[PDB]
């Protein structure tokens, strides 16, 4: 797997091996973030495995990843949903298309991404990949937002930034 | 380091090497939990290092540990504060002396402890021990308690149980006053 490096205008300029790509000096690359809900409308919150190179052991939104060259954002979501959580989903819908951020994790590992955000509903049960996910919780979105508003540091920085975007949050309130 | 083993009534019976003692088969032993506030009245929340045997990478109250043989619970609190956090404190106050709990962590390691809970004020800068603590936040208690009520699964179980105890909570509230 690779990440796709981006320039100022946001044009792909090349690739890097994914693990190799996330360092103390991570360069701008393409990513996605996804928020998964079940048929009943609960939000799936996950806890990244301890072996993750960036933000290991951190609570965060359902699934995030790195689109590969020539891959649509929607397919990346579907691929990573299957891969990390072994779950099938409805066609991902856009909730925050211009999200972009840079952040540093407690060990100094940086994420620097153009990171469009999507939402979808699961259509099958989870089958956890414990290389990616060490724990998860099916929750009411309202409580998760309250938790995010009260103690944002208990969650991944990008999850917090997405959920506090006025529009994203409105859009998330529709899967409930 | 060792833990002090206890029976049902909470009577010491002996000691055990610490790492050795914390397994999927943890016996009742003595411990402590402490909630630390700065002069401003903010609560120190910490994140356990990734290398901890139990609940690594989890957010939790300021400092916990295991008193050693010949050691008072309060002295143990002072030592761990120093060891984990580099920080000097005011004499620890008892806020939940009969807290006891058993809990299984995400990889199956058991804590089974008689764990009196204290609160204190820090009187020096922090000097985080990255061997023990991977991250921290200085917070408003109210925010913390709201977080714990909204998403209790995002914190250590003992933080949650202590925080929801009526009496403990009242006493933590007393440490939010600014104090010169
Ligand atoms: C929101 N950004 C961090 C996307 C990060 O996704 P991951 O960290 O899960 O990358 P990957 O899942 O591909 O390992
Ligand atoms: C509240 N319990 C967990 C006390 C044990 O906390 P620790 O994990 O800090 O034990 P130790 O600090 O001795 O390693
Ligand atoms: Mg991922
Ligand atoms: Mg400790
Ligand atoms: Mn990335
Ligand atoms: Mn113990």
Chain B interface, best mutation among A136, A150, A152, A156, by max B CB count within 10 A: A150
Q: Do the Cβ atoms of A56 and B50 come within 8 Å? A: yes
Q: Is B64 a catalytic residue?
A: yes
Atom number of ligand 2 nearest to Cα B158: 1
Q: Which one of the ligands is nearest to A21 CA?
A: 5
What is the count of residue pairs from A and B with beta carbons less than 8 Å apart? 63
By CB atoms closer than 10 A (0-12, 13-18, 19+), residue A125 is exposed
Chain A: nearest CA to B48, how far in angstroms? 10
Number of domains into which chain B is organized: 1
Q: Do the Cβ atoms of A144 and B155 come within 8 Å? A: no
Q: Which one of the ligands is nearest to A26 CA?
A: 5
Distance between CA atoms of residues B148 and B144, nearest Å: 6
Q: Which among B140, B130, B132 has a CA at the least distance from the CA of B175?
A: B140
B26 lines ligand 2 (CB under 6 A): no
Report the 10 Å Cβ neighbour count for A11: 9
Return the bridge partners of B138, or none.
Answer: B44
Q: Who among B57, B143, B148 is closest to A57 (CB)? A: B57
Return the bridge partners of A30, or none.
Answer: A114
What Cα–Cα distance (Å) separates residue A108 from each residue in A19, A29, A153, B95? Answer: 15, 18, 16, 36
For atom 3 of ligand 2, the residue with the nearest CA is: B64
User: Under a CB-based contact definition with an 8 Å cutoff, are residues B134 and B5 in contact?
Assistant: no
User: Which residues, in sequence order, are CB contacts of A111 under 8 Å at separation 6+?
Assistant: A22, A26, A31, A54, A55, A101, A102, A103, A105, A158
Chain B: nearest CA to A48, how far in angstroms? 10
Return the bridge partners of B32, or none.
Answer: B65
A48 lines ligand 1 (CB under 6 A): no
Distance between CA atoms of residues A156 and A103, nearest Å: 10
Per-chain residues with Cβ under 5 A from ion ligand 6: B 31, 111
Per-chain residues with Cβ under 5 A from ion ligand 4: B 64-65
Which of A64, A74, A81, A115 is catalytic? The answer is A64
Report the 10 Å Cβ neighbour count for B131: 11
Which strands, in side-by-side order, build the sheet including B100-104? B12-17, B2-6, B29-30, B110-114, B100-104
User: Under a CB-based contact definition with an 8 Å cutoff, are residues B105 and B24 in contact?
Assistant: no
Pairing between β-strand A110-114 and β-strand A29-30 as defined by DSSP bridges: parallel
CB burial of A12-36 (b: ≥16 within 10 Å; e: otherwise) equals eeebbeeeebbeeebebbbbbbbbb
Q: This structure's resolution (angstroms)?
A: 2.0
Taking each helix axis from N to C end, the angle separating A141-150 and B141-150, rounded to the nearest 10 degrees, works out to 160
Paired tokens of B62: 């300021």
Paired tokens of A85: 């959580």
What Cα–Cα distance (Å) separates residue A35 from each residue in A148, A158, A160, B108? Answer: 14, 12, 12, 28
Q: Which among B89, B41, B58 has a CA at the least distance from the CA of A47?
A: B58
CA of B107 to the centre of ligand 1 (A): 23
CA of B41 to the centre of ligand 6 (A): 28
User: Under a CB-based contact definition with an 8 Å cutoff, are residues A153 and A161 in contact?
Assistant: no
Distance between CA atoms of residues A129 and A123, nearest Å: 17
Which of B1, B64, B74, B115 is catalytic? The answer is B64
The method recorded for this entry reads: X-ray
**Residue B132: its chain A contacts at CB < 8 A?**
none
Q: After which residues are there C–N gaps above 2.5 Å in chain B?
A: none
Paired tokens of B92: 């620890």
C-alpha of B135 from chain center: 15
Q: Is A113 a catalytic residue?
A: yes
Return the bridge partners of B2, or none.
Answer: B17
Distance between CA atoms of residues A48 and B106, nearest Å: 12
Domain region containing B43:
1-180
User: Under a CB-based contact definition with an 8 Å cutoff, are residues A22 and A113 in contact?
Assistant: no
User: Under a CB-based contact definition with an 8 Å cutoff, are residues A3 and A16 in contact?
Assistant: yes
- DSSP structural state of residue B129: -
Q: Do the Cβ atoms of A146 and B143 come within 8 Å? A: no
User: Under a CB-based contact definition with an 8 Å cutoff, are residues A5 and A14 in contact?
Assistant: yes
Q: Please report, for the domain that includes residue A133, its CATH number.
A: 3.90.79.10
């Amino acid at each position: 797997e690779h990440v796709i490096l981006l320039n100022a205008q946001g044009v792909p300029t090349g690739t890097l091996e994914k693990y190799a790509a996330h360092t103390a000096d991570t360069r701008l690359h393409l990513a996605f973030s996804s928020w998964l809900f079940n048929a009943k409308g609960q939000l799936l919150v996950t806890r990244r495995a301890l072996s993750k190179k960036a933000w290991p052991g951190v609570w965060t939104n359902s699934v995030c990843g790195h689109p590969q060259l020539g891959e649509s954002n929607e397919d990346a979501v579907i691929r990573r949903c299957r891969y990390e959580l072994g779950v099938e989903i409805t066609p991902p819908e856009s909730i925050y298309p211009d999200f972009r951020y840079r952040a540093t994790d407690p060990s100094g590992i940086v994420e620097n991404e153009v990171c469009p955000v999507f939402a979808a509903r699961t259509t099958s049960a989870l089958q956890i990949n414990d290389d990616e996910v060490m724990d998860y919780q099916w929750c009411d979105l309202a409580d998760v937002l309250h938790g995010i508003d009260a103690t944002p540091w208990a969650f991944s920085p990008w999850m917090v930034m997405q959920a506090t975007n006025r529009e994203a949050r409105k859009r998330l309130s529709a899967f409930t």
